[PDB]
Amino acid sequence: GLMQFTLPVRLCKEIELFHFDIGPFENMWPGIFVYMVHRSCGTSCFELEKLCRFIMSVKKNYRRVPYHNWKHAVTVAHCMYAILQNNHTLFTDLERKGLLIACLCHDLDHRGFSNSYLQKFDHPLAALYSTSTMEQHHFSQTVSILQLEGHNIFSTLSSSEYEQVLEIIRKAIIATDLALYFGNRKQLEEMYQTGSLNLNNQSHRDRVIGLMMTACDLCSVTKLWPVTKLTANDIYAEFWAEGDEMKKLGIQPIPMMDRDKKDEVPQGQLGFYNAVAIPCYTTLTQILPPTEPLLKACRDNLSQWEKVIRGEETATW
Numbered sequence: 473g474l475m476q477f478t479l480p481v482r483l484c485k486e487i488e489l490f491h492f493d494i495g496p497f498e499n500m501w502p503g504i505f506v507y508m509v510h511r512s513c514g515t516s517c518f519e520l521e522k523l524c525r526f527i528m529s530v531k532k533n534y535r536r537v538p539y540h541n542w543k544h545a546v547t548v549a550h551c552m553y554a555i556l557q558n559n560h561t562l563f564t565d566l567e568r569k570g571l572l573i574a575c576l577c578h579d580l581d582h583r584g585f586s587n588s589y590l591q592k593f594d595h596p597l598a599a600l601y602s603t604s605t606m607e608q609h610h611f612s613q614t615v616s617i618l619q620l621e622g623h624n625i626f627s628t629l630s631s632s633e634y635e636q637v638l639e640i641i642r643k644a645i646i647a648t649d650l651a652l653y654f655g656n657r658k659q660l661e662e663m664y665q666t667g668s669l670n671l672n673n674q675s676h677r678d679r680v681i682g683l684m685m686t687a688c689d690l691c692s693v694t695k696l697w698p699v700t701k702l703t704a705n706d707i708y709a710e711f712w713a714e715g716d717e718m719k720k721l722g723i724q725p726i727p728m729m730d731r732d733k734k735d736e737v738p739q740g741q742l743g744f745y746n747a748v749a750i751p752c753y754t755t756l757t758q759i760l761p762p763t764e765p766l767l768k769a770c771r772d773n774l775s776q777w778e779k780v781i782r783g784e785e786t787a788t789w
């Protein structure tokens with residue numbers, strides 16, 4: 473009840489900033505997540521005994537892949553924590569609870585392969601869920617862990633609150649399907665400009681929560697250049713492994729995934745910042761002004777990739 477987590481001074485201060493890196497010490501990541509829940513939500517949101525038992529079961533069900541790992545899960549939760557702290561009054565007690573948990577669980581049991589590779593492989597998960605294949609699996613694994621004995625961190629909620637929070641988490645996790653992002657942001661664009669955006673319209677909140685989920689999920693491109701540059705190695709190690717597996721099925725992979733085309737990566741990063749990341753943080757900034765620093769950080773990193781192309785520095789790779 474009276475038991476707070478406290479972090480060392482540099483973390484206590486830097487964790488409040490969007491560009492915070494959670495560091496290389498795996499064993500502090502659970503304490504960092506709990507610290508965030510306590511400040512974002514309250515010391516009472518979750519029985520600490522149950523939260524800890526949930527955190528460690530979630531950790532166990534992330535795999536040892538280069539990028540879609542436990543570190544990713546906690547990095548995405550931190551970005552969501554920063555958005556929630558900089559927009560104190562825009563979100564209910566249920567939404568704050570639900571979204572930190574959704575971010576921690578959004579990539580549970582990721583094998584390092586895209587929905588597309590599951591479909592071409594004819595993976596059983598692609599029979600069971602025709603669209604948003606991995607994302608439906610992630611929500612499925614989340615519900616599993618909530619139903620382990622002593623893992624129900626939501627048990628203190630009323631029946632109808634319990635249903636609202638699992639529905640917030642389901643939409644939040646489905647929204648991390650980047651195929652769904654393009655249309656979601658186009659609509660949020662139209663609504664903002666024609667002035668029709670209304671955060672009391674539940675279908676509007678859903679869309680806005682979806683964009684936050686894409687923003688948090690992509691937040692590696694909003695770090696200081698050296699974090700962003702080294703995380704790109706991890707991202708491309710999964711892509712190249714998937715490309716190798718495509719070649720094993722007798723399919724030439726897209727260049728992004730082909731390790732014989734590393735020279736094309738910098739232009740491919742420009743594409744990604746311009747087609748995906750910049751538009752994502754722009755629309756997010758328009759709807760939630762205090763998230764501007766994510767857009768500014770993203771612009772800085774696009775500009776660092778422009779320099780990689782012009783030979784004014786190189787990624788070792």
Ligand SMILES: CCO[C@H](C(=O)N/N=C/c1cc(OC)c(Br)c(OC)c1)c1ccc(-n2cccn2)cc1
Pocket residue numbers: 586650651689690691692693704707711740741743744747748
């Ligand atoms: C496997 C292919 O699927 C990718 C996906 O769904 N997620 N990709 C996340 C992602 C995160 C990153 O950092 C947070 C970075 Br860097 C990064 O670099 C390329 C990628 C995908 C990649 C590129 C595009 N694209 C559309 C216009 C242009 N590109 C669309 C989808």
Ligand SMILES: [Mg+2]
Pocket residue numbers: 578579606648
């Ligand atoms: Mg995912």
Ligand SMILES: [Zn+2]
Pocket residue numbers: 544548578579648689
């Ligand atoms: Zn993710």
